[PDB]
Amino acid sequence: SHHIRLLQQLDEQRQKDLFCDCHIIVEGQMFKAHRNVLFASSGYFKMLLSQSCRDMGEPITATFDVFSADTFTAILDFVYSGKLPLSGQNVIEVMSAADYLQMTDVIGVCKMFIKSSLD
């Protein structure tokens, strides 16, 4: 119960722009999140944020142009909730953006959605 409650409050912080030390700019859209959460949930951010892992001050700004803003929205919502809204239209786009960000958990969820829909 503690885990579910904590992540809901962590999701509330990024919505209210609280303790957001990381800015993600995808398709010209701004996304606010926490550095310690992205470092722990994505292999790409583990490498990108490793340089300034102990230095605090200016929020680290990251830019992406390889996936859409709606695709990153479903991925970023999964990080702060554990729920990934998958459908026949975005299952391939989300899974394709997941391996670039090196998120093995998202890839497995998208792969399971395909196996279920195909059966």
Added chain:
Amino acid sequence: FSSHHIRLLQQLDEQRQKDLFCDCHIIVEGQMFKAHRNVLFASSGYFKMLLSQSCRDMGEPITATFDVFSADTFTAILDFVYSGKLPLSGQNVIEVMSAADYLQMTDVIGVCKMFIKSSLD
């Protein structure tokens, strides 16, 4: 229950052990504790109030000092924040619950209250 929640909190604890993204230092009984501000803000009413002034300002790590409870008492509480497991026994169940109401942590109080009701029944 969900694996994503369990996995994330385990990695957050690894960061605090390795002093990664730790923008908050807690000094209790002369012992140094490193942790994250966003995690403490979400798990404690006191830290929600303490970090509310610098919730959007980043820079110098916020240092918090406590002298009303011991370092071993705060260790069990801080470990519960980064794991969800609270080792309770007859020696520290009252000290942890007393320190929980000080930090305004209703979740820790409920665990101690459930631990007392179970042992006596």
